[PDB]
Enzyme design. Structure first.
Site, PDB file in Angstrom:
ATOM      1  N   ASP A 148      41.409  21.591  91.989  1.00 33.53           N
ATOM      2  CA  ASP A 148      40.308  22.334  91.392  1.00 33.53           C
ATOM      3  C   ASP A 148      39.012  21.532  91.517  1.00 33.53           C
ATOM      4  O   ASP A 148      37.934  22.105  91.731  1.00 33.53           O
ATOM      5  CB  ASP A 148      40.590  22.661  89.922  1.00 33.53           C
ATOM      6  N   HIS A 175      45.136  24.777  84.978  1.00 33.38           N
ATOM      7  CA  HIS A 175      45.162  24.825  86.468  1.00 33.38           C
ATOM      8  C   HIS A 175      45.311  26.250  87.031  1.00 33.38           C
ATOM      9  O   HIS A 175      45.599  26.383  88.220  1.00 33.38           O
ATOM     10  CB  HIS A 175      46.310  23.913  86.921  1.00 33.38           C
TER      11      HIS A 175
END
Lengths: 310, 310
Positions: A148, A175
Site C-alpha cells: 500500500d 490492508h
C-alpha cells in the site's frame, strides 16, 4: 548472521530479491507445498552472492524454520480483485493456522511477517495460534502492508512530478479496501485538492484491480507484492542487526485505541517493534475515513479470532 | 535517456530486476504472446522507481520496439537436459527470425542481446536477418552467455572459500556443452588441480541439469537466467551511457580466428562493442578444450546461417 524463512515461496520473485539483497553471511530457506521448491532454491543458488539458500517441500515446514530469525508467510492463493472468492478465505486461513503452529514449535522467537491475505484477518489468526502455544510476542508479529505504501509513493510521485524514490507516504489502518488509509496530508511540500485526495485514496485502495484488468483476469500483482515483501523483510533484517532509524508502517497488535490490530508507523529494532509511533495529525478527510472504516476492520479481526477460538 | 525492450518477458523476473535497477529516467517495454503481459507491466509500474514501463501482447512486437536502445530477446521455449534438440530448434529459430525482422524494421540501431537458445545458432540467425535487411552492425549483436559466467563464479568461490562477488571467471567459446570454456587458469590468486579443473568444467557445462533434476523435471533455471540477463543488460546500458571499463564476455561476430561467432571478453562502449579483447594465455587443458569445440561450434553457426539463407 541472520536467517530468513519464506513460507509460500511460489514463483520466487521474493526469493530472488532476498538472494540478491540480503547481507553477506545471511541464510535463506524456501518452503512451499509445490514439489518444484527445492529446485527453485537450486536455481537461485547459482547466483554468486554470499547468501546460502535451500528449498523444501512436502507438508513439514520445520526444516526451513530451524534457526529462523525472520519468517515471511506468503503461502495460499494470491489476492485478485474480481475473482469469485468462493472458499478462498477458508483455504488461506487454514494455511496460516497450520504454518504459524509450526513456527510456534520451531522458531517462536522469530519476527513473523504475514503476507497471506486477507491480512486484516490472517494476522489475528496468527496471534491466536501463538497465544494458544504460549509464545506470543506482540512486538514480533506483523501484517505486511508495505504494498500500500509503495503504490502510494508511485501514484503521488506521478501526480505531482516528484522522483518516485523520494516520496514516502504514511499508510495506516488495514490492508483491504476502505481500511487502507494513505496520509496524503503528511507528504511535505505537496498539496492536493479535495478531489485529488478522494481520487488518489480510491486508486490506492483498489490498485490491485488495475493489474487484474490489464491481465484480462489472468493473474494478480505478484511482482510488486514480491518487491513490497522484500522491502519489509530487509527492513526487519537491518533492524535486527542493529541499524537505527528503520521505520516501516505495518499491521500490529498495538495499544488498541482504534482496533486490536492496526497499521501505524513503527520504529523497528533488535527485538522487533522498538516503538509504535504516533499516526500524527490527520486532515478532516483522513479523520473521517479512519472512523468510517473501523466497523469493517473490527469485523475482519473478529473473523480471525473466531477461526482459531471457536 | 535509455529504453530497453524485453521480447519474451515471460513471468517477468528479468523485468523485475530491470525495473528496480535501471538508471532513473530509463524506459522499459515488455512484449510476450501471453495475454497477461500488459498487466505484468502494470504490476511492475506500481514499484516506485523512475523507470517508465509498458507491456504488450498479441503478435506485433513493434510498439515495444519503438525507440529502443537495447533489445533483449528471451522468447520461445527454454532448453532442458535430454530434450530433443530438433524440437527446440524448430520452435525457436522461426521465433528469433520473426522478432529480429521486426527489430530490423523498427529499431535497427539498437544493441541486440539474444538470450533465446540455442544461442550459438540463434545469434547467426539474427545476423543473417539483419544483413538481409541491410542494417547489420556486428558491434551491436550479442549472444548472452552471462549465465555461464555467474555459475562459474559461484562454483569457484564455493570450492576455494572466496567471496562470491570478488570472483570473475572469463568464459569463452559458446553457450552449450563442450563449447562452454571457463578459463580457470586465468582466475587471479587461485590455482586448481587438474582434477578440480576437469570437475568444475564439467559442472559448468551441465549446470542447468542440477536445477531440472532438483525440480524433478518440473522446470528450469529461470531465476538465475533472469539475473544473468539483467547483469548483461545493465552493463550494456551503463556502457551506452558512457561508463568506462565495462567488460563482459559475450558471443559476437569477431576476427574469425576460431569461428565466425565466438564468445570472448569485450570492452563495451557507446556503440556496443568498443574492443574485442584477446583471450590471453590458455593452459594445456584449455587449449585442448578450445580445439575440441570448433567442429560443434562451426556446425551450430552454419545451421543458423542456412536457416535464413536457404
Amino acid at each position: 548472521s541472520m536467517k530468513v524463512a519464506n513460507l509460500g515461496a511460489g514463483i520466487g520473485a521474493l526469493a530472488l530479491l532476498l538472494k540478491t539483497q540480503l547481507p553477506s553471511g545471511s541464510e535463506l530457506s524456501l518452503y512451499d507445498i509445490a514439489p518444484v521448491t527445492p529446485g527453485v532454491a537450486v536455481d537461485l543458488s547459482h547466483i554468486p552472492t554470499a547468501v546460502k539458500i535451500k528449498g523444501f517441500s512436502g507438508e513439514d515446514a520445520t526444516p526451513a524454520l530451524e534457526g529462523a530469525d525472520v519468517v515471511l508467510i506468503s503461502a495460499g492463493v494470491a489476492r485478485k480483485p474480481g475473482m469469485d472468492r468462493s472458499d478462498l478465505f477458508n483455504v488461506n486461513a487454514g494455511i496460516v493456522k497450520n504454518l504459524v503452529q509450526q513456527v510456534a514449535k520451531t522458531c517462536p522467537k522469530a519476527c513473523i511477517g504475514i503476507i497471506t491475505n486477507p491480512v486484516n484477518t490472517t494476522v489475528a489468526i496468527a496471534a491466536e495460534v501463538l497465544k494458544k502455544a504460549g509464545v506470543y510476542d506482540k512486538n514480533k508479529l506483523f501484517g505486511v502492508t508495505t504494498l500500500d505504501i509503495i503504490r502510494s509513493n508511485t501514484f503521488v510521485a506521478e501526480l505531482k512530478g516528484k522522483q518516485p524514490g523520494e516520496v514516502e507516504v504514511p499508510v495506516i489502518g488495514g490492508h483491504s479496501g476502505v481500511t487502507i488509509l494513505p496520509l496524503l496530508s503528511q507528504v511535505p511540500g505537496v498539496s492536493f485538492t479535495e478531489q485529488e485526495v478522494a481520487d488518489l485514496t480510491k486508486r490506492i485502495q483498489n490498485a490491485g484491480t488495475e493489474v487484474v484488468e490489464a491481465k484480462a483476469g489472468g493473474g494478480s500483482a505478484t511482482l510488486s507484492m514480491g518487491q513490497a515483501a522484500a522491502r519489509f523483510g530487509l527492513s526487519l533484517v537491518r533492524a535486527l542487526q542493529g541499524e537505527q532509524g528503520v521505520v516501516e508502517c505495518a499491521y500490529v497488535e498495538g495499544d488498541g485505541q482504534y482496533a486490536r490490530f492496526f497499521s501505524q508507523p513503527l520504529l523497528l529494532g533488535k527485538n522487533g517493534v522498538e516503538e509504535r509511533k504516533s499516526i500524527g495529525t490527520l486532515s478532516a478527510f483522513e479523520q473521517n475515513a479512519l472512523e468510517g472504516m473501523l466497523d469493517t476492520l473490527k469485523k475482519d479481526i473478529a473473523l480471525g479470532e473466531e477461526f482459531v477460538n471457536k
